[PDB]
Amino acid sequence: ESADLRALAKHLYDSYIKSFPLTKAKARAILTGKTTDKSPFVIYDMNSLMMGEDKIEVAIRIFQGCQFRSVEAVQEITEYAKSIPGFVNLDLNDQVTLLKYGVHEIIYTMLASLMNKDGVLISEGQGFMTREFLKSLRKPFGDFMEPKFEFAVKFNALELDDSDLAIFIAVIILSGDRPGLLNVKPIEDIQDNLLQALELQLKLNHPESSQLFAKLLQKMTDLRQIVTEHVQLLQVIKKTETDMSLHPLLQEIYKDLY
């Protein structure tokens, strides 16, 4: 049983590496300055943003950039989900439901991998935009950016690696209590096994942190409240900003969400 849980953990990690180009390992190699690759271009104000356009209203332009990356990330997450044993055999409408309610929780999680207290890696690590530049963006855009860093700081304190994250993300996707699911048990059964794989992963990979599994279960709960607030912050933008356009994929995900 345990051997099979480790094989599952490895399968998920290998799929995670195929599905997500910029891993936390690669990202930390960039942020700490340990890569043979040339440094990311730092964007900290309007002037540096202008200069680095080829390397990578201003607030609206940055928001659209976030949208384009989110659309790309949704497609990466979808490919990863399809690698989770049993997922593609679920009712197709349930697969859609799991992604609809799952993707933004996963994006919050995976953004953390690319973030430190000072900023976020963008354009596959070719750019680095500072937290304070993003927070300084005029209302209501500044307050849309900051919560992602606030979560990242707390989440990164857990010191998870890519192997941990692969299973954590899989558990989140296979949540049997998403609104409107038709066949709950097959999803719950997959999640129960993924949760066993996660517990064993954390016991072996973080032996001196017994609390980690319980904390991660709480983070899954926290992410729901975080994403609800994210959806509210988007309404302060979408409803008030007249020339604001949402990408069709994102419009679909946000439509009738909760």
Binding site: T78, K82, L92, Q95, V96, L99, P248, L249, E252, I253
Partner: peptide, 11 residues
């Protein structure tokens, strides 16, 4: 019929 469904069905 949706974009998520189309992404899910692509091999």
């Amino acid at each position: 019929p949706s974009l998520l469904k189309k992404l899910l069905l692509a091999p």
